[PDB]
XYZ file of C-alpha atoms in Angstrom:
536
model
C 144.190 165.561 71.694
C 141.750 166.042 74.508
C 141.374 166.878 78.208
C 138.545 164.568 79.393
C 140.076 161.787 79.808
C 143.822 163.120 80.996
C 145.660 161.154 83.955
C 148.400 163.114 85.782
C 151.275 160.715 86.618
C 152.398 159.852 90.452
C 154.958 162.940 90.490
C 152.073 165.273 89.060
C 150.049 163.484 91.534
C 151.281 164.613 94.916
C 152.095 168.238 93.546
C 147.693 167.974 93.078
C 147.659 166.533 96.266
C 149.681 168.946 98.236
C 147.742 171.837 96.446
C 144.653 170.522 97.156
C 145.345 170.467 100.781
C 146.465 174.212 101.320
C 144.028 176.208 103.778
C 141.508 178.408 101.680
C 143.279 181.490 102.242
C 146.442 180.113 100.313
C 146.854 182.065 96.925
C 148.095 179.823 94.354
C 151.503 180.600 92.061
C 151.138 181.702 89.075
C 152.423 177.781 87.769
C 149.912 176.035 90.484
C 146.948 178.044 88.590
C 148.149 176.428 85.150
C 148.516 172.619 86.610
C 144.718 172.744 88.502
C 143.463 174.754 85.597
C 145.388 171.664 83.117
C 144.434 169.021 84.889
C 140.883 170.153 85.984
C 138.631 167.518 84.823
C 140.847 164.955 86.339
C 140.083 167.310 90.079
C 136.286 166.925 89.317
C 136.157 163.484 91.425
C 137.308 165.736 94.279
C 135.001 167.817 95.787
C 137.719 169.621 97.977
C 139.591 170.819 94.645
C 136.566 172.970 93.530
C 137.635 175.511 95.598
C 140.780 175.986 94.240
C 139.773 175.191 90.645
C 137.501 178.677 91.103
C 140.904 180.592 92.552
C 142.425 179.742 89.084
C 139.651 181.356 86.888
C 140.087 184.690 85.432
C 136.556 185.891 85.740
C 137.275 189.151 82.787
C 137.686 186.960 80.613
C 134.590 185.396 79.052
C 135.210 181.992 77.536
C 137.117 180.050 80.090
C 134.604 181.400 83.315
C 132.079 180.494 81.014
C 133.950 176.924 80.898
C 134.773 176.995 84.604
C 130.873 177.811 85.475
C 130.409 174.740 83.187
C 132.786 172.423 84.886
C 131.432 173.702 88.679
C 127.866 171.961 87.388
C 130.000 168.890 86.648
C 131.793 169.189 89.330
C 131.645 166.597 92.976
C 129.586 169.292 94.685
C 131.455 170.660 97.452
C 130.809 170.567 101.172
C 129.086 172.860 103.113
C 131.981 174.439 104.944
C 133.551 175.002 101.619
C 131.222 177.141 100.284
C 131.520 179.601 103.242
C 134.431 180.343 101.236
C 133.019 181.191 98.079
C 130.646 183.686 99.989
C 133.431 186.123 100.977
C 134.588 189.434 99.464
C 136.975 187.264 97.339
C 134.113 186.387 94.673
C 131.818 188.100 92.718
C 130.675 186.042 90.070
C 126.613 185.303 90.541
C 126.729 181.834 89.543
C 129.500 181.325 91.588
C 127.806 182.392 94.610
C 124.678 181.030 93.826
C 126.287 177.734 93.818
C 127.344 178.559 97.373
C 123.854 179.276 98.604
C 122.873 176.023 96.825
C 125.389 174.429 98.929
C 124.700 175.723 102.417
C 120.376 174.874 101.611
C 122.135 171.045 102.292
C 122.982 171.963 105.596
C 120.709 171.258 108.512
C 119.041 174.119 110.284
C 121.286 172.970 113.955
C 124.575 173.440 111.865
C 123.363 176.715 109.760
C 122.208 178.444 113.057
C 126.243 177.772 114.251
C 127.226 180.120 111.014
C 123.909 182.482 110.955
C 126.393 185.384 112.434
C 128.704 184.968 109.795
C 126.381 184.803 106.690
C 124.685 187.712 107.991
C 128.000 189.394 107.261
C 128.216 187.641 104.244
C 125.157 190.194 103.382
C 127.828 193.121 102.860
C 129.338 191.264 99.634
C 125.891 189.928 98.026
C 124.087 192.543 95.484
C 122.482 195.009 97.137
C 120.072 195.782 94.149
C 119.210 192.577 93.925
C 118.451 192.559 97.693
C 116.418 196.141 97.294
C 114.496 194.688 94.346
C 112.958 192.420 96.205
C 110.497 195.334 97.538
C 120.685 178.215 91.782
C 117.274 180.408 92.033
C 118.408 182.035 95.529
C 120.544 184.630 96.050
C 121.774 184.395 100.241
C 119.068 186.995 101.204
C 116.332 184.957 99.859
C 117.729 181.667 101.389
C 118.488 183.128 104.954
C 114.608 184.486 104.593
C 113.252 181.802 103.843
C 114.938 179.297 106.272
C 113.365 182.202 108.988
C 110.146 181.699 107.518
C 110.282 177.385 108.794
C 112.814 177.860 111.582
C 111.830 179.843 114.487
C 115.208 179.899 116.308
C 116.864 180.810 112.938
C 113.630 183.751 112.411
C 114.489 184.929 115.982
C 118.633 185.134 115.729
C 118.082 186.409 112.090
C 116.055 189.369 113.506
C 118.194 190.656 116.522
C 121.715 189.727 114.312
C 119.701 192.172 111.513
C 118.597 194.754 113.584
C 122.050 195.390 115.619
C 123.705 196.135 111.705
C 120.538 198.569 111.430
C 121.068 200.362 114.626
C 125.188 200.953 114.053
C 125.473 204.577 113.704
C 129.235 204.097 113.084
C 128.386 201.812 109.537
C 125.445 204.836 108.954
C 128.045 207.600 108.407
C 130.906 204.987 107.333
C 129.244 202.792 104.574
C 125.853 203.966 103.787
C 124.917 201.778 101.230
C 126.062 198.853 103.518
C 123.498 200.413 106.045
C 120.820 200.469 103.718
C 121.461 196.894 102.650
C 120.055 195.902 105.537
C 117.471 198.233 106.294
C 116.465 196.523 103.451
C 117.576 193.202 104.624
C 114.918 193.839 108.164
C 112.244 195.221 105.079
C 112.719 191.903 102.824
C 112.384 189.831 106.319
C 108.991 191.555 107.472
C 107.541 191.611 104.231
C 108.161 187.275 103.756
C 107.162 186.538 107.030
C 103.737 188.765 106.033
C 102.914 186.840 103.168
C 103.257 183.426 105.735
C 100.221 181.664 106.594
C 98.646 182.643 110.249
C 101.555 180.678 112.373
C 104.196 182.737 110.477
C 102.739 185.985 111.144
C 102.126 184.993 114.440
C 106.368 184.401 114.872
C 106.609 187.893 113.103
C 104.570 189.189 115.959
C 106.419 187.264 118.841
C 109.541 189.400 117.604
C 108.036 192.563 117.708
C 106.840 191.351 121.252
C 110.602 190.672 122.290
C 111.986 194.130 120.580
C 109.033 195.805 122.580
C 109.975 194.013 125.785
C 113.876 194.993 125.434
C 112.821 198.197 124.579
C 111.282 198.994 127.476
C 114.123 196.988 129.746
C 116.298 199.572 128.091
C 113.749 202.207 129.168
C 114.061 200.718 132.839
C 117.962 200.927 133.190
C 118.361 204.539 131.783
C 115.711 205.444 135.077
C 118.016 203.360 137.731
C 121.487 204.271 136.470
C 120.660 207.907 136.252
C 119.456 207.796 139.871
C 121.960 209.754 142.738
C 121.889 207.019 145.723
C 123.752 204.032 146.341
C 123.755 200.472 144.874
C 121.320 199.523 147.887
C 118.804 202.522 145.826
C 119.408 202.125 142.973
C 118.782 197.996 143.565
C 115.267 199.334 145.268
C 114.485 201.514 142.783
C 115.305 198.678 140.341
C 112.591 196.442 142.118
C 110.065 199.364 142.546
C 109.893 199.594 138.746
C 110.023 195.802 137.810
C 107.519 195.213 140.202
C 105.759 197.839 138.702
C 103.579 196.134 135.915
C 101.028 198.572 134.745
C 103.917 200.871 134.642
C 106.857 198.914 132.795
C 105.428 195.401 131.984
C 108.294 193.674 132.808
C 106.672 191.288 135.765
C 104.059 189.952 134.024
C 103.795 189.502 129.973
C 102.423 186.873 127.180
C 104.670 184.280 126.726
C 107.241 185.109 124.044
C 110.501 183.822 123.078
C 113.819 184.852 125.127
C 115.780 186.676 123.129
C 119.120 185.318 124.712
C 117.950 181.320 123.929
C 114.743 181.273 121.947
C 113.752 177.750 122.875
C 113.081 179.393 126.123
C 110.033 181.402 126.522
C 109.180 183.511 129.809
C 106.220 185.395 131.175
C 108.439 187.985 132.671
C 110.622 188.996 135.158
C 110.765 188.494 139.111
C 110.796 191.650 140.570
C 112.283 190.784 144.147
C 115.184 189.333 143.097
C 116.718 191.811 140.672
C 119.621 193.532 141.547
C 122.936 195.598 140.170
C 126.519 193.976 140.064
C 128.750 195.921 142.077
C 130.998 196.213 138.588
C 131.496 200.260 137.713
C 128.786 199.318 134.132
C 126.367 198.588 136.919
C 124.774 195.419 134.677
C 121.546 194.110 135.891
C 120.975 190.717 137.074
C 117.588 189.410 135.977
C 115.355 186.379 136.611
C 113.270 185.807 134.187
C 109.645 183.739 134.370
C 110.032 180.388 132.536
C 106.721 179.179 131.034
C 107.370 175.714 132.687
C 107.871 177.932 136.161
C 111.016 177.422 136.727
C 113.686 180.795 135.716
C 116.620 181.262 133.702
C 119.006 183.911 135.747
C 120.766 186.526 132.847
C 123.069 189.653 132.926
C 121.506 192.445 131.066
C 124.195 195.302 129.936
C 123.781 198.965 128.921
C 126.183 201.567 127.561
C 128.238 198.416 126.968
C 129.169 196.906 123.573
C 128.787 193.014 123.542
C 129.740 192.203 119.887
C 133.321 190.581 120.233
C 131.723 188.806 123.033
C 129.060 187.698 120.858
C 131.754 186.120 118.269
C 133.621 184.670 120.466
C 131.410 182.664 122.336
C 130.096 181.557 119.383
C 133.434 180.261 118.360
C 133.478 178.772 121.530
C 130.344 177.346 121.115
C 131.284 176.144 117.603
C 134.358 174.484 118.613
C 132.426 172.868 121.500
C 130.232 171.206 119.399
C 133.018 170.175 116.881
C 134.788 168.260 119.576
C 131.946 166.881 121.153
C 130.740 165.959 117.531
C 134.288 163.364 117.377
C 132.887 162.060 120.550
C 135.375 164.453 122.917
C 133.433 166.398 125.456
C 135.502 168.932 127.378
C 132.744 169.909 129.949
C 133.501 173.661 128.447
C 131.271 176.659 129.238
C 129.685 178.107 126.058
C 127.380 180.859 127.731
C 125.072 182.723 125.769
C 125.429 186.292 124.302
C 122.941 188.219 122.425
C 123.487 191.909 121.631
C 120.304 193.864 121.569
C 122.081 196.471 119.868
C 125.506 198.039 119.487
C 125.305 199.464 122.828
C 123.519 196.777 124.960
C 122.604 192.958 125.375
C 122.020 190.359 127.418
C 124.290 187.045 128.753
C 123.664 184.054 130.167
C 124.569 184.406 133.973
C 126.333 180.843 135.218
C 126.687 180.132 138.926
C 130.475 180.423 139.485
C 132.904 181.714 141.458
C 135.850 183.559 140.394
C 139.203 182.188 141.308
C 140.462 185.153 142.706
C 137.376 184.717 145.357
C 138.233 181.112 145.642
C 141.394 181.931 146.924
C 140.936 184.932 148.997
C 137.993 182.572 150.826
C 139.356 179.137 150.513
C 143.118 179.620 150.164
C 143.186 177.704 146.507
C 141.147 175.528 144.371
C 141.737 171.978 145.785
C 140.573 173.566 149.170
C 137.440 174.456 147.200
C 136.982 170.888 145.480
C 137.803 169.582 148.943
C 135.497 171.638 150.954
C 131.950 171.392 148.463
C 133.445 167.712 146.589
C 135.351 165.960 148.985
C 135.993 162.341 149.174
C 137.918 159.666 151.226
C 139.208 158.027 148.406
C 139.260 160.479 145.586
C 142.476 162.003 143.891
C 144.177 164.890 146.442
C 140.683 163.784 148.480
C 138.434 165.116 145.589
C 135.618 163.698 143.920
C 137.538 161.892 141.180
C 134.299 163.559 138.894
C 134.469 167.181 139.716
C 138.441 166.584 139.459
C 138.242 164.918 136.086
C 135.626 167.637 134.939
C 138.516 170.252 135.998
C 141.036 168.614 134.261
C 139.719 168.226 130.952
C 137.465 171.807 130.751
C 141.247 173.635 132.149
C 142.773 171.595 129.006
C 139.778 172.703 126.792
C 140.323 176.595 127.520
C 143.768 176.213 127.095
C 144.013 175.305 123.537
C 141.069 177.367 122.747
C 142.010 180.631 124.259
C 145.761 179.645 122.684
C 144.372 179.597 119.649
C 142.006 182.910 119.837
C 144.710 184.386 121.428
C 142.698 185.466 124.648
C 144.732 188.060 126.380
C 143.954 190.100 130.096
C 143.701 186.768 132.178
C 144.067 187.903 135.554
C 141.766 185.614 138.311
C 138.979 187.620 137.914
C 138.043 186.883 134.662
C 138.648 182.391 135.131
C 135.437 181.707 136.813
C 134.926 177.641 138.792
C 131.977 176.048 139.382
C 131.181 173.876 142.233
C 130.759 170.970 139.691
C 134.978 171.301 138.659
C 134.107 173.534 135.573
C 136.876 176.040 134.520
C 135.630 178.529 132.211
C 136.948 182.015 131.011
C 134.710 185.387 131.050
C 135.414 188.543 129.300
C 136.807 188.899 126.010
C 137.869 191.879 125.308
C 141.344 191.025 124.194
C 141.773 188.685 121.780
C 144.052 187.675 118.815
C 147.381 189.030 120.616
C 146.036 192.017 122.449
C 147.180 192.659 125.726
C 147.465 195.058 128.433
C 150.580 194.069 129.466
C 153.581 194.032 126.722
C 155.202 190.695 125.754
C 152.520 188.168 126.607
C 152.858 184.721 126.591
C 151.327 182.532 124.035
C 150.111 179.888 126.185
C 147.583 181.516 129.240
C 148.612 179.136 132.345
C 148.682 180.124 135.911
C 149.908 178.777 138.880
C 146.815 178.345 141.010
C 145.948 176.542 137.800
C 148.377 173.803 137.834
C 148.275 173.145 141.527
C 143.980 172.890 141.402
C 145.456 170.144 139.105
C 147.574 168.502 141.928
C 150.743 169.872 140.704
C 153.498 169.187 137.813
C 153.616 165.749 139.245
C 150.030 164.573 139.504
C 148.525 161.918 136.639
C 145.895 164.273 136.427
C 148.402 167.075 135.495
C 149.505 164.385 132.362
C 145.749 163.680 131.519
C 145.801 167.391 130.864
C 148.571 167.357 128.674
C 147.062 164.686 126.939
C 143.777 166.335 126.384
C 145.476 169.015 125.199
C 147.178 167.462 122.494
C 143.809 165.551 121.375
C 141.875 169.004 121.769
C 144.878 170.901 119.505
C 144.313 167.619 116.628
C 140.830 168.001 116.390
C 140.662 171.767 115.893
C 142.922 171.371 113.280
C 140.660 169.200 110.897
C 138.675 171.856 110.993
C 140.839 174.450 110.421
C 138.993 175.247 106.858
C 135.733 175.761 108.663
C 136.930 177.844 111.574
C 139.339 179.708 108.877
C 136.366 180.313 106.408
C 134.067 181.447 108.664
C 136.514 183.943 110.580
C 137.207 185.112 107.017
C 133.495 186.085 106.738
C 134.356 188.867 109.275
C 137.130 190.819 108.375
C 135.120 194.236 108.123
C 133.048 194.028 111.299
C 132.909 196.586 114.336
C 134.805 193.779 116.135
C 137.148 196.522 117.930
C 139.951 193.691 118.098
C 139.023 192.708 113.972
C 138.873 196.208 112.687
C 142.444 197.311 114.216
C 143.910 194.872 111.520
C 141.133 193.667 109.294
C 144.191 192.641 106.322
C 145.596 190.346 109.611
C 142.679 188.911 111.303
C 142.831 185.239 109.605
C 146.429 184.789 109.934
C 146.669 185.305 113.548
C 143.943 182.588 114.062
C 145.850 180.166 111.188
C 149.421 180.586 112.738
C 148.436 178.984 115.790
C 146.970 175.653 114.100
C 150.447 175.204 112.763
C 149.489 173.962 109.690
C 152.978 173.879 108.404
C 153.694 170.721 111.165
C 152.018 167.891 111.355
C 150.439 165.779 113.530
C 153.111 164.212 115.130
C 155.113 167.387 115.116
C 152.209 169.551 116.114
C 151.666 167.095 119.010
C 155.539 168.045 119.650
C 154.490 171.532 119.259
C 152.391 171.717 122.177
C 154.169 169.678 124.798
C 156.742 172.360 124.438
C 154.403 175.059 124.987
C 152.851 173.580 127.910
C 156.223 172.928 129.359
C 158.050 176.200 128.794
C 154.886 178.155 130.088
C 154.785 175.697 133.565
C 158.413 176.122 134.025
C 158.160 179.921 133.512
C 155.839 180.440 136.146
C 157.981 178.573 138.980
């Protein structure tokens, strides 16, 4: 007469099994609730049914949450990626999402920094008296704190991914509280890292260093843009100022961290070497001092927002590191991007060339391989490397900006390197967006598929092929990449906030989690071959 010890037979079986395996942002019939809710001590040997165990719940009433909190301590605790779910607006419950916190404290700080801009908008759906108060123990606040406190890379992108919520004057007059919330998120952050021993107030003082430092670079731009004169001017003026060190301090400074990667700390900035893209923002290139002596070239933007840029090359970035972690290396791109605030930041400059330049000077991308790569007996008279480098980081973008839905890909923005790297720039279309109506859902080009050797090359087939392995991958990971897009629905993402009620769906759609592998394999072929006839 009692659950413990129920067995659901084979039929009752799959029904778990197919329920089990629904994305997270599948709501359950009214009759699936009942079956998982039935059978849920059975699901406690499955780590992956928590999730939907908690969907079932009725959290008003009092005696079954108070039996489902008891059955998430018995439960097969949950993996980390998981519990990104359980940190969304979709639960409230304090137990329930101080089991989540519990669960992410497993994960190692390399893998937390990859979510770090995602919990911190996890922030706007913790308890923001809680997180005032402060002047299963850990609410996320606390946790992210206090993984700042040991981690300096995590202390550093915790600070400027804090600060840019504190400086949004849109979230001031739109959400208030929200805006508060992390003033006193910045507070709760200064105030831990104060009661650190000496090292730990010695980090805290390193950031003030770098705000002071892009303060003052901010400071420097507003004098050069605002100066009547030509590029050639404005670049000496530039110079004049940089060079300038009593003045601006930007030549020569006490080592501190770069804000842009961390794990890199400079001395300053060369002054005679500085200069203004010819692009109408007029962004600064700067080389910064490396403490070793070497220097890490970097675009710095103002009067420019970088934050959609920021997520998505950290998806990017993410989704690089997921394939490489099954062993598959697409010799992608993932450049840095750090906003400073909401209207400036800095990027990681890559020597490239765009493919509209390689054309205009070359006449088309094999001339390019040919002319800095070439080789006797390589494919097309390529380096068989560089070519094999093109090939896979072309199939790489492909299913990723497929999937992201990258629109506005004219040859400007499709950037080579000498090396056969094909990366994409300049993001400020995404999930569908376009300039142009009726885009296509596969972003091919021409130029593209002949750099490749052509329709009938092997190399053009080792693309498809990388493709398809690229497209599987992503897909196991679906949950994590779903959950943690999920985590910013109400951002000032420009291309999120149009359709914040949409955002995950247009991202889900394009894993085609309703096919399979073989069929999703099927699914792609097509694509690849309707877009390459289209564009002949």
């Amino acid at each position: 007469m009692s659950d413990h010890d129920l067995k659901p037979n084979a039929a009752t079986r799959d029904q778990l099994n197919i329920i089990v395996s629904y994305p997270p942002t599948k709501q359950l019939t009214y009759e699936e609730q009942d079956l998982v809710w039935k059978f849920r001590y059975y699901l406690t040997n499955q780590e992956k049914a928590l999730t939907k165990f908690l969907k079932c719940v009725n959290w008003d009433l009092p005696q079954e949450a108070k039996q489902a909190l008891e059955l998430l301590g018995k439960w097969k605790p949950m993996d980390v990626e998981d519990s990104l779910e359980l940190l969304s607006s979709h639960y409230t419950n304090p137990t329930v999402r101080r089991y989540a916190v519990a669960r992410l404290r497993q994960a190692d700080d390399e893998d937390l920094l990859m979510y770090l801009l995602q919990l911190v908008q996890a922030l706007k759906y913790e308890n923001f008296d809680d997180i005032k108060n402060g002047l299963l123990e850990q609410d996320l606040c606390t946790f992210l704190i206090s993984r700042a406190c040991k981690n300096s890379t995590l202390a550093n992108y915790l600070y400027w991914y804090v600060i840019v919520e504190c400086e949004d004057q849109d979230t001031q007059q739109r959400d208030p509280k929200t805006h508060e919330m992390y003033l006193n998120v910045m507070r709760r952050f200064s105030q831990a890292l104060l009661k650190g021993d000496k090292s730990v107030r010695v980090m805290r003082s390193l950031l003030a260093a770098q705000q002071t430092f892009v303060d003052r670079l901010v400071h420097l731009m507003k004098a050069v843009q605002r100066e009547s004169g030509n590029r050639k001017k404005k670049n000496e003026r530039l110079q004049a100022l940089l060079g300038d060190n009593e003045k601006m301090n930007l030549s020569d400074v006490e080592l501190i961290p770069l804000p842009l990667e961390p794990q890199v700390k400079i001395r300053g900035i060369i002054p005679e070497t500085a200069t203004l893209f010819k692009s109408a923002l007029m962004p600064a290139q700067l080389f910064f001092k490396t403490e070793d002596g070497g220097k890490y070239p970097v675009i710095f933007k103002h009067g420019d927002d970088l934050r959609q840029d920021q997520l998505i090359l950290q998806i990017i970035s993410l989704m690089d590191k997921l394939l490489r972690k099954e062993n598959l290396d697409l010799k992608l791109t993932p450049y840095k991007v750090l906003a400073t605030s909401t209207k400036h930041g800095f990027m990681q400059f890559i020597q490239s060339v765009p493919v509209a330049e390689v054309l205009d000077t070359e006449g088309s991308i094999q001339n390019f391989f040919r002319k800095y790569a070439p080789s006797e007996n390589g494919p097309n008279g390529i380096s068989a490397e560089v070519m094999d480098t093109y090939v896979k980081s072309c199939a790489g973008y492909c299913v990723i900006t497929y999937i992201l839905g990258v629109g506005d890909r004219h040859l400007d923005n499709l950037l080579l390197t000498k090396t056969g790297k094909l990366f994409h720039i300049d993001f400020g279309y995404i999930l569908g967006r376009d300039p142009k109506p009726l885009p296509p859902p596969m972003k091919l080009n021409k130029e593209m598929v002949e750099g490749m050797g052509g329709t009938q090359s092997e190399q053009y087939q080792e693309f498809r092929k990388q493709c398809y392995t690229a497209f599987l991958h992503l897909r196991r990971y679906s949950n994590l990449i779903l959950n943690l897009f999920s985590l910013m629905v109400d951002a000032n993402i420009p291309d999120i906030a149009l359709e914040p009620d949409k955002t995950v769906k247009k991202v889900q759609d394009k894993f085609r989690l309703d096919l399979s592998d073989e069929e999703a394999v099927h699914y792609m072929q097509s694509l690849i071959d309707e877009s390459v006839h289209a564009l002949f």
